[PDB]
Design an enzyme around this catalytic site. Structure first.
Site, mmCIF file in Angstrom:
data_model
loop_
_atom_site.group_PDB
_atom_site.id
_atom_site.type_symbol
_atom_site.label_atom_id
_atom_site.label_comp_id
_atom_site.label_asym_id
_atom_site.label_seq_id
_atom_site.Cartn_x
_atom_site.Cartn_y
_atom_site.Cartn_z
ATOM 1 N N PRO A 1 24.498 75.675 131.505
ATOM 2 C CA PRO A 1 25.606 74.721 131.609
ATOM 3 C C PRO A 1 25.851 74.222 133.039
ATOM 4 O O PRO A 1 25.482 74.894 134.008
ATOM 5 C CB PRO A 1 26.816 75.523 131.116
ATOM 6 C CG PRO A 1 26.384 76.957 131.094
ATOM 7 C CD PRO A 1 24.909 76.940 130.874
ATOM 8 N N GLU A 2 26.455 73.039 133.154
ATOM 9 C CA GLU A 2 26.876 72.468 134.423
ATOM 10 C C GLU A 2 28.405 72.426 134.425
ATOM 11 O O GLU A 2 29.058 72.950 133.513
ATOM 12 C CB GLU A 2 26.184 71.104 134.637
ATOM 13 C CG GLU A 2 24.657 71.265 134.509
ATOM 14 C CD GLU A 2 23.843 69.959 134.554
ATOM 15 O OE1 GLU A 2 24.254 68.977 135.211
ATOM 16 O OE2 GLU A 2 22.738 69.936 133.963
#
Ligand SMILES: Cc1nc2[nH]c(=S)[nH]c(=O)c2nc1C
Length: 267
Positions: A1-2
């Site tokens: 994830p970012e």
DNA sequence: CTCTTTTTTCTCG
DNA sequence: GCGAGAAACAAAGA
């Protein structure tokens, strides 16, 4: 994830586990607790979760007055809230058990980390990592951004991924940002002119804030996202840019797969 | 069968 | 200091 996916997880957790007392903590993979699993279990068992914050891609659980649990999901980490009798799944590593359910951390690649940090050490922890500003108009100062770009001979995409110019961009959103700002990923930053830096600055903020509103890109917390339908270049190799017939190309830049539209993104 | 593909930190030269 | 490459790890695909 970012950052947008981590912020989505943060918001779902804040709604559901704040106020909950930790009854027990169990690990099948204690090695991901970098500060020591036995210490973390001793300190946090019986404490109540007061809040969940985020800094860059890091989740920060506020657990009692004097401890924070800093969690990084790295490439594939996922949290879910399950009943107490939920069966174990193969890549589950850690569970925080409450009275009426449990929070389970799973990570196929085992990259994600947990760190127990005292409250007054949280700000020094992020200073030591040199994390840059949050991607908001209030925090992301274009004037400093521009000075750092002028003083460097790094390529813009690797430099953006370092988290020091601004926090929270990873491989998906840096490709989206550079396409939106019409900047070649291998452009040397000291060659960027002021008007391009301004568009890059605004595009970083707008792409990340739009992604947050759409719940990120994608059964766990944060798999509800709609941002993946708005990606213009990432993972779309050979598809049209809508730029009058031009196709998206994929190259490798500093070891990362890199999607860009060559017509719109010349050096 | 091999080789490549998908965040952060470390080693090497 | 720098860039290149790889390490940590698992699974899927060419
Ligand atoms: C803290 C840090 N995070 C990073 N994250 C990503 S996605 N790429 C990087 O090259 C990178 N580099 C540093 C030093």
């Amino acid at each position: 994830p970012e950052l947008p996916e981590v912020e989505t997880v943060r918001r779902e957790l804040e709604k559901r586990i704040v106020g909950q007392k930790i009854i027990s903590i169990e690990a099948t993979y204690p090695r991901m607790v970098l500060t020591g699993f036995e210490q973390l279990k001793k300190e946090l068992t019986g404490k109540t979760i007061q809040g969940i914050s985020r800094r860059g891609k890091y989740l920060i659980f506020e657990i009692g007055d004097d401890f924070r649990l800093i969690s990084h999901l790295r490439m594939e980490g996922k949290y879910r809230l399950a009943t107490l009798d939920a069966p174990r799944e193969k890549h589950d590593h850690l569970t925080m058990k409450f009275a009426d359910g449990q929070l389970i951390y799973a990570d196929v690649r085992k990259f994600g980390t947990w760190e127990l940090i005292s409250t007054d050490q949280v700000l020094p922890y992020f200073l030591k990592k040199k994390i840059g500003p949050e991607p908001t108009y209030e925090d992301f100062d274009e004037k400093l951004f521009r000075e750092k770009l002028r003083k460097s001979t790094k390529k813009i995409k690797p430099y953006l991924l370092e988290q020091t110019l601004v926090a929270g961009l990873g491989n998906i959103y840096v490709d989206e940002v550079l396409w939106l700002a019409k900047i070649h990923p291998e452009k040397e930053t000291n060659q960027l002119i002021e008007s391009s830096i301004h568009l890059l600055h605004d595009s970083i903020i707008e792409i990340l804030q739009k992604a947050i509103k759409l719940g990120g890109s994608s059964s766990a917390l944060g798999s509800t996202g709609k941002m993946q339908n708005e990606l213009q270049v990432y993972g779309k190799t050979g598809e049209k840019c809508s730029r009058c017939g031009a196709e998206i190309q994929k190259i490798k830049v500093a070891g990362r797969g890199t999607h860009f539209c060559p017509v719109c993104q010349q050096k």
